[PDB]
Design a protein around this ligand. Structure first.
Ligand SMILES: NC(=O)c1ccc[n+]([C@@H]2O[C@H](COP(=O)([O-])OP(=O)(O)OC[C@H]3O[C@@H](n4cnc5c(N)ncnc54)[C@H](O)[C@@H]3O)[C@@H](O)[C@H]2O)c1
Ligand SMILES: NC(=O)c1ccc[n+]([C@@H]2O[C@H](COP(=O)([O-])OP(=O)(O)OC[C@H]3O[C@@H](n4cnc5c(N)ncnc54)[C@H](O)[C@@H]3O)[C@@H](O)[C@H]2O)c1
Ligand SMILES: NC(=O)c1ccc[n+]([C@@H]2O[C@H](COP(=O)([O-])OP(=O)(O)OC[C@H]3O[C@@H](n4cnc5c(N)ncnc54)[C@H](O)[C@@H]3O)[C@@H](O)[C@H]2O)c1
Ligand SMILES: NC(=O)c1ccc[n+]([C@@H]2O[C@H](COP(=O)([O-])OP(=O)(O)OC[C@H]3O[C@@H](n4cnc5c(N)ncnc54)[C@H](O)[C@@H]3O)[C@@H](O)[C@H]2O)c1
Ligand SMILES: CN(Cc1cc2ccccc2n1C)C(=O)/C=C/c1ccc(N)nc1
Ligand SMILES: CN(Cc1cc2ccccc2n1C)C(=O)/C=C/c1ccc(N)nc1
Ligand SMILES: CN(Cc1cc2ccccc2n1C)C(=O)/C=C/c1ccc(N)nc1
Ligand SMILES: CN(Cc1cc2ccccc2n1C)C(=O)/C=C/c1ccc(N)nc1
Lengths: 251, 251, 251, 251
């Protein structure tokens, strides 16, 4: 595969429906050696299983909310991968209360803090802790959403976090590019993961007349982390069937 | 003046060089009734002096880092302005050690936290606190910079915070539009305030062949807060002499 | 008025509903001295009538489809306005058969040709013709629409022409900036002029909860052509109530 | 390869340095059957040669300036490929005089016409003439340049053409997407093809600190025309090493 000989760490794999799962699935298919992380014990076993299926026994725990945790995870990873070629950041979160109803009423300083810390800072936090471990040609990838570019109902504060994240991508790519490291993000269209009325609207108005799948994303992700996309960095590639580039298709 | 009859609150005045300062005068010239805030004991003096010059004597203390300080400030403002027509958010801060050198190495979880909190959340926290006090036809304005759309050396984490802020503009605009509130931002070009080699560069490659002044920004601010801009909301108006829409002008 | 002392040329007035019309009044209210153009024998009458109402009696013929017509018009304008301060370009046209049904099937090489020629080249052809007549501090303005940034049903080729036009704005702004000329565009939201189901939709999903008026556009136009916008050039200001910065509002 | 079983027509191959050449090179490597076109006789032989090297004897002539020519080319193609899966549009041109010096002085109505007809309309012209021949899952790709988004010195009218082209991409993707056809473009960074001082500037300021190669582009092109990018349509993927997402790196 076009990922043969690459070593990629994959975060955010919670189930078979997780985008991270579809990405891992596709990267493995292309010959990449994988390593996974899991937030907490409630998933350790379940995650080790998905890992086995992809020829991996490198299942490390990591809470990106804690620097010590991230450092510890990369220390372990180091034991088996003194060097690797990048990682996939598939982490997003905001206290439930934040995601429903009028944005201005819902948002809270604390809600804002957490959503930005976890959904945006953790990305650079991770790059920061494994920077000396990256081989030339490595690639870092994160997942964003249209809520960052446009004001979407109920998405609220998660929208500001994604925008912060999309800028993090540009600053990260600009800082690390000189040492042979590329950084990008994939703005995926809506998908059904760990709303239904929405996927309905999306399907009818999206150009390809269907919502994207973790497979469609997995393939773009694999591409974006392979040498095939060597000329791409700091980009936010839209993988939403062209949903965002059209308007008033509903009418 | 096209602002006569409008009661606008102006934050961030620090000195005659301040942007909020250039904005206050322009708004004053156009006939607006102003209120001023000051962050601490160090600035109160200078803020009252300037306010006096612009016919105002409503100088309230406020530290956007604290919700209580914001509620209290708006409580005091209520005694004199039961209702008003918007406010200018000219507040931006990142711990010094953050805006220097390689971005990935300078940024830290705390610096990131403070930057976003003071530069982005403070804007909506303020809208939160005075939402009921706003008259239909009110307008909210904040100041952003190009580091939000593109990776600019040394601007580092502020770039992420400004992006979060420009997204805030969109969400706030979308949430408050129904009750008659517009929300926009001015992405101002560089201005020497409270760097020389950068200005020299900008003046040479900027279409109008000079950097913008707090008067230029001031006039655009007065406009964005007057009923003349009634058809603009959730927008980021570039007031940088067209610098950002050009490329490779140095050559 | 913030336009007193300015001599501005306004093209495209066709009726009291016309956008250029809403612009002429606003500019007049603010104290601008205006000149008017008319395309053919069918419109001359109505244009002179309106001009008279706004204190002007400079009604010149001009068909932007012909370079000679443009040179001649500016030659006549020279007799009364040796120099002036800019002009409003409110001209847009595509052969009828182009704006209906599937884009790929409707478009044709000729329709494409005419659309771009009348909607985009005419703007710079006009700047060409009067470049020496423009005073430092002059401003040029054109009108665009969202179909330039996103694919909108039935707008078809006009969408391509508007994009060419918005790019023209940038190049013209960059070329003329050094001699003191600013060049901007207003991307106006939909307005019923010389479609009902579309408006109903827009009013519901637009942040301010209504479609913009030629007054809204008019006031923003006066501003973009006054020295108040001295810090804005090569910009595309969205005057659509924030419609474009929202997404999935229907749901 | 990930293009196994796909049939792609490739235009714009003029030499070994042509981007089209690097794209063909990479698509062939991935198992795609190719077909080529050549503008005029002066290239027939030379193009047939490049074709042989890629297992192709399908070398058809085609002047995109003429509808009859395009129809004739697809008629021939039909004889050998009654059905295929998309094509690569690598065609750009503007009368020499147009590309140097102040844009406003250089541009001419005729210059504008040709540049837009050849560099932008031909893309949809081709889609139009082969629409019934595309299998579900087909993909159309065109090449754009940053000059479309920003005002670049000397690029002049070619900048407006590229913008028109980038919008054509969105409208084309929106119209054809429902029949299982995707349409995208690659905004490539500068490359040395059939200026030097510029590649210098680009290298020092680009994040990956180097200009992209026809190889880097060829790979993105192959990806964009393969089922791996099934979730991408109407997008303008930047393959310039992240040049456009950074600013003031020169300082
Ligand atoms: N599902 C969609 O519609 C969609 C669309 C576009 C982009 N995205 C983005 O893609 C990413 C993956 O989302 P998903 O849809 O696969 O959901 P998911 O719930 O399947 O996976 C997201 C992961 O968040 C991780 N997480 C949360 N807090 C964490 C913490 N403190 N430390 C470490 N890990 C933590 C969990 O382990 C989980 O596996 C997110 O960033 C999301 O915003 C989702
Ligand atoms: N000067 C430029 O080059 C430039 C360009 C574009 C945008 N901006 C933006 O414009 C705004 C004003 O900047 P400036 O150049 O006038 O600088 P300034 O230092 O003169 O003013 C900024 C204000 O930040 C306020 N502040 C910081 N923390 C605060 C807190 N916790 N509570 C209350 N107030 C607090 C201070 O009182 C200060 O007056 C900023 O948001 C800045 O990012 C500046
Ligand atoms: N009305 C809307 O919904 C809307 C929204 C956004 C932008 N716009 C843009 O604003 C501008 C004005 O449109 P309008 O709605 O006022 O329509 P309108 O028909 O009232 O006015 C447009 C003008 O086009 C002029 N014109 C066409 N070909 C010409 C030629 N060859 N020479 C000289 N003049 C010529 C006509 O004289 C006419 O008055 C257009 O460029 C349009 O694309 C309109
Ligand atoms: N070279 C760069 O720096 C660069 C960067 C980004 C994008 N691009 C774009 O990529 C495409 C390919 O350019 P290139 O750099 O490979 O140059 P090139 O000269 O090698 O190839 C371009 C092709 O234009 C074709 N052409 C011109 N007029 C034609 C007509 N009337 N009918 C049919 N074919 C015609 C020629 O056959 C030629 O092969 C262009 O659209 C260009 O604008 C070039
Ligand atoms: C793109 N998405 C999915 C999504 C959530 C959501 C909420 C409101 C509207 C749309 C929405 N979409 C598409 C995400 O990034 C997920 C965000 C998210 C969800 C729950 C949570 N606890 N933290 C973060
Ligand atoms: C736009 N600016 C000014 C600025 C800083 C900067 C750093 C690098 C490059 C450009 C830069 N510009 C224009 C700002 O927003 C200021 C941010 C700032 C500065 C110090 C501080 N302690 N907190 C915030
Ligand atoms: C913005 N508009 C109005 C408009 C047309 C249109 C078509 C489809 C969808 C929206 C649409 N809007 C807002 C225009 O620029 C008008 C273009 C136009 C109309 C007729 C014509 N003969 N030439 C040009
Ligand atoms: C991206 N490029 C290359 C290029 C030409 C050019 C001219 C001025 C400045 C930059 C420039 N670049 C990068 C192109 O699209 C080619 C355009 C082109 C060149 C010659 C020609 N006769 N027709 C079209």
């Amino acid at each position: 595969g076009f990922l043969s000989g690459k070593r990629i760490l994959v975060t955010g794999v919670a189930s078979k429906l997780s985008i991270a799962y579809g990405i891992a699935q596709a990267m493995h298919r292309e010959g990449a050696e994988l390593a996974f992380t899991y937030q907490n014990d409630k998933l350790k076993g379940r995650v080790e299983e998905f890992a086995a299926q992809l020829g991996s026994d490198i299942v490390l725990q990591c809470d990106v909310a804690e620097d010590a945790s991230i450092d510890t995870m990369f220390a372990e990873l180091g034991k088996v991968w003194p060097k690797f070629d990048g990682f996939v950041h598939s982490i997003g979160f905001a206290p439930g209360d934040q995601l429903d109803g009028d944005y201005v009423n819902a948002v809270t300083r604390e809600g804002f803090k957490i959503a930005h810390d976890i959904s945006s800072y953790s990305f650079v936090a991770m790059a920061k802790a494994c920077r000396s471990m990256l081989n030339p040609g490595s690639a870092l990838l994160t997942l964003s959403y249209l809520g960052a570019e446009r004001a979407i109902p109920n998405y609220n504060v998660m929208g500001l976090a994604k925008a912060s994240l999309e800028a993090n991508v540009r600053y990260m790519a600009n800082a690390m590019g000189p040492e042979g490291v590329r950084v990008n993000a994939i703005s995926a269209g809506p998908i059904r993961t760990l709303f239904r009325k929405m996927l309905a609207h999306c399907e009818a108005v999206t150009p390809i007349r269907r919502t994207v799948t973790i497979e469609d994303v997995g393939n773009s992700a694999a591409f974006l982390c392979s040498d095939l996309s060597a000329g791409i960095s700091g980009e936010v590639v839209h993988v939403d069937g062209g949903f965002s580039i059209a308007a008033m298709n509903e009418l």
